[PDB]
């Protein structure tokens, strides 16, 4: 059971970037995937979630209207599309599982990928 992320780097402001979150050991159809962000001096901040079975989504106010989540259940992977990037989006981004439909909170997390807005 593992979550592995890719896609983080130096981004021009107003630019866009796609983070991905690949799963091993469980099927993302069975669960929600969440994205959570750690901006320096702002702790941990919930960003978004997706229910891959029907692609239903929820977004935090800080990113609503700019970021979207997508999922491919065949490749067992979820994608955070980041449009219209800003300075405040600079953070380490993690994906996590909502274990047992939230009963186990975020019981699995990926390593993180740093998004820098240069």
């Amino acid at each position: 059971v593992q979550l592995v992320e890719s896609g983080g780097g130096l981004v021009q402001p107003g630019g866009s970037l796609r983070l991905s979150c690949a799963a091993s050991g469980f099927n993302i159809k069975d669960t929600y995937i969440h994205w959570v962000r750690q901006a320096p001096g702002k702790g941990l901040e919930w960003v978004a979630r997706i229910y891959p079975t029907n692609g239903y989504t929820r977004y935090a106010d800080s990113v609503k209207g700019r970021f979207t989540i997508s999922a491919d259940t065949s490749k067992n992977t979820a994608y955070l599309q980041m449009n219209s990037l800003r300075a405040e989006d600079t953070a380490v981004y993690y994906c996590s599982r909502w274990g047992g439909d939230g009963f186990y909170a975020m019981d699995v997390w990926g390593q993180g990928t740093l998004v820098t807005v240069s």
């Binding site: 702790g43 901040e45 919930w46 929820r58 993690y94 186990y104 909170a105 975020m106 997390w109």
Partner: protein, 106 residues
């Protein structure tokens, strides 16, 4: 939107000390509080879910507890590796809100 307030924001302590961190919810969360450890360089790790359940594999020196309102994480005998930041979270309603974090420096 539920506000999770941690206390204190930071603390110092020596190996072997007991340390308690406290989390308070602006509204009822019927026992749905989780605690995470994030060591510098690393992704957060779940320690406690639903206030006092210990996640399999996590050392029994970590303990969660409730009294309402309020929520408490205790590390009963601090090890060298336990230097990290600790975050509470309510997983009662969406969105999942985090506490500010408490940096434990050891």
């Amino acid at each position: 939107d539920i506000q999770m307030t941690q206390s204190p924001s930071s603390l110092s302590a020596s190996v072997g000390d007991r340390v308690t961190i406290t989390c308070r919810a602006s509204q009822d969360v019927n026992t749905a509080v989780a605690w995470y450890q994030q060591k510098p360089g690393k992704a957060p790790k779940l320690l406690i879910y639903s206030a006092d359940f210990l996640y399999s594999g996590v050392p029994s020196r970590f303990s969660g507890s409730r009294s309402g309102t309020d929520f408490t994480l205790t590390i009963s005998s601090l090890q060298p590796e336990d230097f990290a930041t600790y975050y509470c979270q309510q997983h009662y309603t969406t969105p999942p809100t985090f506490g500010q974090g408490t940096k434990v420096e050891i």
